[PDB]
Each structure stands twice: as structure tokens, then as C-alpha cells.
Write a protein that binds this ligand. Structure first.
Ligand SMILES: NC(=O)c1ccc[n+]([C@@H]2O[C@H](COP(=O)([O-])OP(=O)(O)OC[C@H]3O[C@@H](n4cnc5c(N)ncnc54)[C@H](O)[C@@H]3O)[C@@H](O)[C@H]2O)c1
Ligand SMILES: NC(=O)c1ccc[n+]([C@@H]2O[C@H](COP(=O)([O-])OP(=O)(O)OC[C@H]3O[C@@H](n4cnc5c(N)ncnc54)[C@H](O)[C@@H]3O)[C@@H](O)[C@H]2O)c1
Ligand SMILES: NC(=O)c1ccc[n+]([C@@H]2O[C@H](COP(=O)([O-])OP(=O)(O)OC[C@H]3O[C@@H](n4cnc5c(N)ncnc54)[C@H](O)[C@@H]3O)[C@@H](O)[C@H]2O)c1
Ligand SMILES: NC(=O)c1ccc[n+]([C@@H]2O[C@H](COP(=O)([O-])OP(=O)(O)OC[C@H]3O[C@@H](n4cnc5c(N)ncnc54)[C@H](O)[C@@H]3O)[C@@H](O)[C@H]2O)c1
Ligand SMILES: CCCCCCc1ccc(Oc2ccccc2[N+](=O)[O-])c(O)c1
Ligand SMILES: CCCCCCc1ccc(Oc2ccccc2[N+](=O)[O-])c(O)c1
Ligand SMILES: CCCCCCc1ccc(Oc2ccccc2[N+](=O)[O-])c(O)c1
Ligand SMILES: CCCCCCc1ccc(Oc2ccccc2[N+](=O)[O-])c(O)c1
Lengths: 268, 261, 268, 261
């Protein structure tokens, strides 16, 4: 009776109740999904946060840079959902980039070690998770990652833009591997959403003027989006992710769905 | 239980039970929609076809090159669904290109009158239907058209490739208009499907090699005789589950377009 | 010494001295090219215009909607350049769209008859000219058309945007035909240039604050463009066309070169 | 007379006389450029290769993973062309990916340490060199890097494809910076060319079929054994004849990427 009814889905990337992952988790559960959650580093906090989700779901630790976490991942998921059950869905909502690689910090000044950390967490880990989880996914399954359209450069996004371009390429190759399991792999390219990560970043760049520029970003995005855009609401993005986790897009893989109000299809 | 529960949706393009529009209509009815169908030219023939759909639905004549048909359409639709009710969905699943514009016929030999007719039916008509039906569409509604990825030239598709390129551009402008009504506009780029147009327009102007090639490039495979995955994709767009996508193209092609070999 | 030394190039599209084609013609001549020119309708006026070019050049009438003009073109060109001589280059710098298909006139209110004529002249005729001239082109030859990037919708450009999308598609097919002859076919996507088509034709469709809307277009373009953009200067565009007419892009065909200051590569 | 007469141009990436950089260098010199060359690893062996060039040019050492090399680059480059002289061109023609990231080795088995090294050398180093060399570039100058179209996935190319996607994105940011110096930044996406990297990196990770399919898809054909058309394109970008193109990608692939089949 729900869009994701009877589906077991892993969701990564909850850190705050504003996280896009949190809303993906909320909407999936509203649509009848049974979730496993993964969290990085602050697991007591994430536990308290996810108490506020509609239903109780098991939380597993996963630092995508930790090889041991990746190697034990499938075993721990299987334990969490019960032996014999497989995942129908996997959500990658994970991103990171050192401040040097962001903002008004000069593009040329980011040291490779910083960039490389960012790309490891933001792009490579999409292949890492897929590698760890594909052997426990059902045919008809769906892996989804979060994207921010990096086809053109822009202020501030800097090296994360580069990491997303890498992510887009990784996704196309994940699809080749995933297809062997009858599993789809796609990205959702979202417009700007007022998550705490989003606001910290622009705030890290512009400081005292960050609040104003954020309101201006919202105005510009809403104007260019033919159906408009609400930065305060992650629901449309979360629904798009759930659509890809459902069986209603069975012939789409290696691809990118734009949940950005249609802004990227307009010049002005 | 139903992805499109309660929605009122107009579906154009049904001519046989292999039509992508037929499968779109079937699946939508299965998912709780109520349809109004439109047919070009063969009304008695289409009526027999549509009698095979899981539920009966009113059938309206529509020639997209006929100005009077377009002018009467909204009123005719309202008459069929009852005053005070509006559409939630519109499906544009039509196209045509004269033989000279297709297959092994030389690209340079297609006369403009031929090309022009093809573009009228396959691309302009998307704006035309939108112009006619937007005044009777509900907020949150959705207009969906059928595309075949024309970003790179290819044998056989010739001038229809040009018509599809125009359509994609048209779709982005319809989205600006449709947005004023709170309505989305998108295309589904489908992989090759065994339809009347496939056999009679394309094949008539010349396929097994095409199925194999497409199935190879597609990471999850491709079945030319199964329009259902395409139909489901259109339904996804007609649903409330892709509420932030407009002016866009969704690829229901097995992932073929994301792979070089 | 000259980039196009010894080459024989047909240039269409000159109507005023602000025409992109006029500057393409000037620079080509400065680079040692020998030219044949084509003009539509106002041929006395055009001839007065072309007298201001650095060098003499035959002027032939060509209305791309006139089948008879198209059928006699090769013969009139060959008569102009001498028998046993062929063209090395062809420039299509031709566009048209009735006022109804542009500006603040509603997108839905443009009749297909208006749009169709616009597509005939702006898109289909690229195939027409190629059909007429390919039999009189040397291997190593080059056909170039003028584009305005239509991959995203925008205010005002309206149905001309659709024509340009059609033209891009046509160019990919012309490339397959031209290939047999060892001839390249490409488009130059220029940024906005203050020709009279811009200021008067598009400008006239813009309503009351037309000038301001066009200046705003320039400011936005200059800003997005990493090297900036000057709407008053067609020379970077004319040079780019000449680059495609030269032997220095011998492996590029069916393609688009962006002479737009790099604006299309930047979101903001 | 020469396309690049009096232009001072740095060219990285020569390792054998099949290198794309070697042919870029050869064509630039034929067109009157004064070159400075950089090499990695076996510089004495590279010197033997660079001696085969038309004119003798200074060879400097540059490992792009070496912060000292990068920090001293401009100083050493200035020493080579003379104090008071600046560069007009910079050619980035380098890249690398460990075997684990290539060919028949499973995509999922490449350790990040390996991928990272490949991304560092192949993509980040484009920004690295720009940062080092922009302060000694004249207005009107041109930075060019080599690309292989990564917009779709493909067998064998694997993680290098990902590095190329990074590079394309890096190029767009390098353009923003280079613009402040009146300098252009672009990539050339080349078709397949028989080089040491083609043979040792890609080939050992596994060939003739690649050439045929590319030549078939290219409207003007394509020759894997001929790097000259690619070198010419790079020189076009180094010249004054593409002065309005930046942050972009020019395809020197025989038009292959514009055709489905
Ligand atoms: N907020 C937006 O506007 C926006 C727009 C488009 C795309 N995105 C993408 O959506 C996803 C989530 O972003 P968000 O806006 O919700 O911010 P967020 O801070 O809520 O989510 C980012 C997540 O990455 C996790 N993470 C960081 N390092 C990790 C590691 N080593 N191992 C495992 N997890 C790690 C964090 O703990 C966090 O949960 C990202 O991929 C982001 O780039 C965000
Ligand atoms: N079969 C495929 O492989 C495939 C792949 C991608 C996209 N498409 C697209 O899907 C849509 C439907 O095509 P199909 O494959 O189902 O073939 P089809 O023959 O089953 O449907 C084509 C329809 O166009 C309608 N039509 C033609 N002229 C008309 C007019 N003047 N006014 C109103 N309607 C008119 C026909 O009556 C018919 O029902 C088209 O837009 C087509 O290009 C088909
Ligand atoms: N001005 C810009 O900003 C700009 C930007 C990108 C692309 N373009 C393109 O460049 C080309 C030239 O436009 P322009 O800006 O130089 O304005 P323009 O008016 O000087 O050039 C347009 C030309 O088309 C010719 N033409 C119209 N109908 C014709 C027909 N039936 N047969 C033969 N010729 C015909 C006109 O006579 C004229 O010479 C067009 O294709 C246009 O779309 C212009
Ligand atoms: N050969 C092809 O088919 C082809 C096609 C398209 C694009 N490309 C690209 O063109 C460029 C040249 O490659 P190629 O085909 O000529 O092979 P190549 O082997 O002749 O050149 C590759 C170069 O990378 C250099 N390099 C590796 N690590 C380095 C480091 N740490 N610091 C500085 N330089 C380093 C090598 O020493 C070498 O000279 C590359 O970026 C490549 O990816 C090659
Ligand atoms: C200008 C901002 C545009 C919108 C946007 C916001 C937050 C994002 O998320 C991250 C970005 C950079 C580094 C870590 C994250 N993250 O996910 O925490 C993102 O990718 C895109
Ligand atoms: C070669 C590739 C074959 C795939 C394909 C088949 C049928 C299609 O339908 C049409 C084709 C040509 C002309 C009108 C139509 N039509 O029905 O709209 C279509 O668009 C694409
Ligand atoms: C928002 C506006 C974008 C302005 C850029 C531009 C200017 C002039 C053009 O040329 C024409 C346009 C319309 C009708 C006839 C012509 N023409 O070429 O004569 C063109 O194609 C593009
Ligand atoms: C599929 C094969 C496509 C053809 C091709 C051959 C060699 C290339 O060169 C490299 C490859 C892998 C790693 C480093 C390099 N390199 O030269 O820098 C390249 O980029 C592309």
C-alpha cells in the first residue's frame, strides 16, 4: 500500500534532523520501507536524532574511509535485517570537503591531501558501498547517491564540484557492476537545501553576509526553476530518491535525476 | 495501492496494443487513474483496440494538425470528465515523419514540406497540446512527452532525430509556461520498442541488430518487445513522486545512453 | 603568411556592416582567403556594404527557400571561381524567425506557419547549402554554421531556441554526408553580439524596456565569462569561424565550438 | 608565417616519440614557437627523445606530485626563457593510473591509495601547474590539457575515466583563475592514439577493435597511428584564433562523439 512497501533499504548520511538523509529516511518509512541506518562518528547523537523518525531502525557505524568498516558492513547489515533477507535499496547521502577546498579560500590553495580526502569520502565511497552491499541486494534493487550538478563551475563550491564530477563518473561504472546483480544505480541531483551542512558552508565562506546571500540564492534558484524551488523543504528531494528506490523507474541506470525545480534546464 | 489513485489523465497516441501509449494507459488504469483517450484518424479501429484496456474510457478525436480540434479539445475534455473537474495528467505519445525523412532514403533528398509536417506532428504539437490543456489542468499536474535520445546522429532515424531535438527544446519552454499553473513538463527518452511506428515508419524506410546492441550497452539489459518499463516511467512522472523535476528528460532505456560500449 | 592563404570560401549572411558574416568575411580576406559572397533579397544594398571589405568578391543571390537558387548555386559559384576550381570553405550565417516566435509575444501564440518558416531558414537550409555545395568542395574542406547555445531554455529567444536545437541536430547529419568528401561540418555557438538582428529583430520583440533587457544579457554574459565578453565586438567570433575554416582543426566535425567567452561553462 | 611565431610555450608529457606531447611540440616548433619542455622520471632518456625534435629546447624536471618541483617551477622556467620573459602557452599532457585501476582488473578492487595517485597526477596537477605558471604568463595566453571523453562509461578505461571527469571539472575552475590574467584554459578530448600509455598502461591491463570502431563512428575517419591532427588542434588552442573559448573542451576525435553508430 506504500510506495516502498516490504522493501528493505539502507540509508547513510544522517547527522542532523535537517540532513537530506533524515528526510529520505522519514519519507521511506512513511511509504512502508524497513530501514537500516549507517552513521559516521557521532553515533550517540545519531541515535537520539533517529528516535525522532516515524519508526525504530537499527543503526550501524560506517566510516567510509575505514577499510574494516567496509569489510564487515555486509555481515553487520545481514545481522541487522536477519539472515536470508537482502537489501532492496541503498542510499548514499554522504559528502565531505575540508574548508581549504571550499568557499572563498583560493581554489589553487587547497593541498592535494585535503582534496583527496574529499574525493575519497564524496566519490570513491560510492563505489566502496556498492562493492560491500551488492552481494546482499535483491534483483530489482536500487542504489542512489546525492549529487549537486557539477557540469558548470560556480563560486564557492570549488573542489566539491570536482568531487561531484568524479561521483557522476563513478556512478556510471557502478551501474555496470550493479547490472550484473539486476541492480540499478543512480544519482539525484538536488537543488540547494537549507541543511545545517549547507548553511555552515556558505556561512564559512561569507560570514556576516552569508544569511543575505543564502536568501538571494533561494530567490535566484526559485526564479530559474519553472515550478519554483523551496530551499527550506527537503521533501521533494526525498520523494525523488524514494521514486528511484521504487519499482517505477526500472529502466533507468547509470543516470542522474534532477530534483532541482528544473533550474538546470533554464539559462535565466 | 495505486501510484495514480484518483488522478484524471489524458492519454494521446494509442493506435495498436503495441503502442507505448497503450501500455501507458494500461498501467495508469492499473494504478488507479481515470483516463480520457485521444485518437488520430482511425477512430473505429482505435476504439476496438482501447476495448482491450482494463477499464473503459471516453475516446476523443484529435488531429494535432487540425486547428479546430485543438480549439475544441478543452471543452470536449471537460464534457467527458464533467464540469468543475480538471486534468491532473497529459500524455503526449505521438509523432510522424514522411518516408523521405527516414531510413535509407538520403538525408539530403527529404523535401522541406515533408520535414515540416514531421516537425509539426512530433514537436510543435507538444506546445499545442499544452496550450490547449493547461487551462484545464490542476496544480501539481504533469505533462509527459515521448522522446528518443537525439543528442548524437545515427543511421535510419534521420529527420526524426531532428524533430526529437526540436521537441526537447520545446519541452523546456512548455515547462516555463506549465510552471505558471503549478504543472510540470517532462519527456521520457525510451529505448527502442517494437511498435507500429517501429515496424512501419522506421522499418518501412529501411532492427534485430539494434535490439542486441541496445541490450549490450544497457547495464540492466533491454527488451524491445516489452513497453511496460517505459510505461512505468511515464507513470512515475505523472505521479507525485517526482515533484521537483520539470523541463527535463528521463531516460527509460536500460542505461544505454550512459555507456559507450 | 595568412591563415587561409589560397583557400576559396563562400560566405553567406551579409545584410548590414554589423552582420557577423561581414566580420567573418573581413578577417578571412585579411587572412588571404579568396571569397564568393551570397546575399538575400536586398542585393543592391548588400553590394554597397561589401564594397567596404578589404578585397573585391563576386556577389551571388541566394534565398535559401528558393529551390531554383539552390539548384543553380554550384554552377554560379564555379562560374565565379573558375572551372576546375572548388571551394575550400562554406559559411552559413543565416537566421530568421517571425516576431511572433520571439520576445514577449507568448510562446503558445506563434502559429506553426511562422515557426516552420523560421526552421526552414535557420535549420533546414544548413542541409540545403551543404547539399548544393559539397559536390564542389575539396577534401580538407570545412562547412561552418552559426549557433546560439539552445541546450537550456531562456526568456525571449523562444522559438529561435527550438530552431537552433534543430540546427545542431542537422549539423550532426551534415557531418556524415560531408565526411565522404573529406569535409568537416561544425557550428560556432557565439555569445550575444550587437548585430542588427540582435538589436532590431530580437530587440523589437522585447517590449518597452528592450535596450535594458539586452544590456542585462551582456552584463550577465560578461560576468559568467571567465575571460569576459564584449557584445560590441564580433571579431573573436569571426576569428573562431576562421579557425574552423583553416587546416588547424582537422579532426573536429559534427561539433560545436563555443565562441562565448566561456560563459556556457559557468553557472554563475 | 608561423601560427605560433614568437610564442613561448611550455610542453609537459613527452616520454617517447609516439607521445601526443612530442607531436604537439613538433607541430608548435614548425609553427615558430619557442619551447620549454618538462619531463618526469628518466630525464636523460627523455632528453634523447626530445633531441629528435626539429629544434633543440631546454628540458626541465617536473614530477607533479613533488611540491618542491612545483614551488621551484616558475623560477626554473624563467631561468630557461630568460628573466623578463613570460610564457604564452602551457600544455598539460600527462596522466597516470596504476594497473589496479585499469583494464580487466575489477573496478571494485582498486584501492583508494591507487585511485588517489591517479587522480593527483591526472587531474589535480592541472590546477597545480596553472597555479605555478599563471604568474609568469602573458595576457592572451593559453593553457591546454589532454582529455579523453569520460561522459559515458566504457570497458578498460575504468578509473582513468573518473580522473578525466575530475579533470574536466578542474579545467572549468582553472578557467576562472586564468581569466584574471587574461589567460584561456581548455582541454582537447582526443580519439585513441597508439602511445606508451596506450600500450603499457591500458594495454598491459588487458586494441585493434578500438581503432576500427572509432574510425567507423568518425565521419571524417580516424587513424590511431597518427597524432598530428590532435597536435594541430592543440596548436589551434595555443594560437590567437580561438580567443573566445575557455573552460571548454575541443573534440579532436574525428567527430566520433557526435554519432551513436
Ligand atoms: N544540502 C544541499 O543543498 C545539497 C544539495 C545537493 C546535494 N547534496 C548532497 O547530499 C548529501 C548529504 O548532504 P547534506 O546537505 O544533507 O549535509 P549533511 O552534513 O547532513 O550530510 C552529509 C553526511 O556525510 C557524512 N559523512 C562525512 N564523512 C563521512 C565518512 N568518512 N563516512 C561516512 N559518512 C560520512 C556526515 O556524517 C553526514 O551525515 C551529500 O552527498 C551532499 O553533497 C546536498
Ligand atoms: N517504439 C520506440 O522504439 C520509441 C522509442 C522512443 C520514443 N518513441 C516515441 O513514442 C511515441 C509513440 O510512438 P510509438 O513507438 O508508440 O508508435 P505508435 O505508432 O504505436 O504511436 C504513434 C502515434 O502518433 C499518432 N499520430 C500520428 N499523427 C498524428 C496527428 N496528426 N495527430 C494526433 N496523433 C497523431 C498516431 O495515431 C499513433 O497513435 C512517439 O512520440 C515516438 O517517437 C517510440
Ligand atoms: N547576433 C548574435 O548575438 C548571434 C549569436 C549567436 C548566433 N547568431 C547567428 O548568427 C547568424 C547571423 O546572424 P546576425 O547576428 O549576424 O544578424 P544578421 O541579420 O546580420 O544575419 C542574418 C542573415 O540571414 C539572412 N537571411 C534571412 N533569410 C534568408 C534567406 N531566406 N535566404 C538567405 N539568407 C537569409 C539575412 O539576409 C542576413 O544576412 C544567424 O544564424 C544567427 O542566429 C547571432
Ligand atoms: N594515447 C591516447 O590514446 C590518448 C587519447 C586521449 C587523451 N590522452 C591523454 O593525453 C595525455 C598524454 O598521454 P599519451 O597518450 O601521450 O601517453 P604518454 O605515455 O606518451 O604520456 C603520458 C605522460 O604522463 C607523464 N607523467 C606520468 N606521471 C607524471 C608525474 N608524476 N609528473 C609529471 N608527468 C607525469 C609521463 O611521464 C608521460 O610523459 C594524457 O593526459 C592522456 O590521458 C591519450
Ligand atoms: C553552494 C552550495 C550548494 C548546495 C550544497 C549544499 C551542501 C552540500 O553538501 C556538502 C558540500 C560540500 C562538502 C560537504 C557537504 N556535505 O554533504 O556535507 C552540497 O554538496 C551542495
Ligand atoms: C532507429 C531507432 C528506432 C527507435 C524508435 C522507433 C519508433 C519511433 O517512433 C517514430 C519513429 C519515426 C517517426 C515517428 C515515430 N512516432 O511514432 O512518433 C521512435 O521515435 C524511435
Ligand atoms: C535572448 C536573445 C539571444 C540573443 C542572441 C542572438 C541574437 C541574434 C540572433 O539572430 C537571429 C535571431 C532571431 C531571428 C533572426 C536572427 N538572425 O540571424 O537574423 C540569434 O540567433 C541569437
Ligand atoms: C579505452 C582507451 C582509450 C585511449 C587512451 C589511451 C591512453 C591514454 O592515456 C592514459 C591512459 C591511462 C592512464 C594514463 C594515461 N596517460 O597517458 O596519461 C588515454 O587517456 C586514453
Amino acid at each position: 500500500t506504500g510506495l516502498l512497501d516490504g522493501k528493505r533499504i539502507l540509508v547513510s548520511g544522517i547527522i542532523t534532523d535537517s540532513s537530506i538523509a533524515f528526510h529520505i529516511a522519514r519519507v521511506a518509512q512513511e511509504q512502508g520501507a524497513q530501514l537500516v541506518l549507517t552513521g559516521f562518528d557521532r553515533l550517540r547523537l545519531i541515535q537520539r536524532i533517529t528516535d525522532r523518525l516515524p519508526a525504530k531502525a537499527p543503526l550501524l557505524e560506517l566510516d567510509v574511509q575505514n577499510e574494516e568498516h567496509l569489510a564487515s558492513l555486509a555481515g553487520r547489515v545481514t545481522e541487522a535485517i536477519g539472515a536470508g533477507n537482502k537489501l532492496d535499496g541503498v542510499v548514499h547521502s554522504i559528502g565531505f570537503m575540508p574548508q581549504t577546498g571550499m568557499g572563498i579560500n583560493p581554489f589553487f590553495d587547497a593541498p592535494y591531501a585535503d582534496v583527496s580526502k574529499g574525493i575519497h569520502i564524496s566519490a570513491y565511497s560510492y563505489a566502496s558501498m556498492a562493492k560491500a552491499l551488492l552481494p546482499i541486494m535483491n534483483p530489482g534493487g536500487s542504489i542512489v547517491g546525492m549529487d549537486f550538478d557539477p557540469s558548470r563551475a560556480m563560486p564557492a563550491y570549488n573542489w566539491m564540484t570536482v568531487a561531484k564530477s568524479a561521483l557522476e563518473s563513478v556512478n556510471r561504472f557502478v551501474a555496470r557492476e550493479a547490472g550484473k546483480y539486476g541492480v540499478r544505480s543512480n544519482l539525484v541531483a538536488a537543488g540547494p537545501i537549507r541543511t545545517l551542512a549547507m548553511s555552515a558552508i556558505v556561512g564559512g565562506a561569507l560570514g556576516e553576509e552569508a544569511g543575505a546571500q543564502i536568501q538571494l540564492l533561494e530567490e535566484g534558484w526559485d526564479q530559474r526553476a519553472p515550478i519554483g524551488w523551496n530551499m527550506k523543504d527537503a521533501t521533494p528531494v526525498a520523494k525523488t530518491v524514494c521514486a528511484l528506490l521504487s519499482d517505477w523507474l526500472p529502466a533507468t541506470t547509470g543516470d542522474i535525476i534532477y530534483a532541482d525545480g528544473g533550474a538546470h534546464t533554464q539559462l535565466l
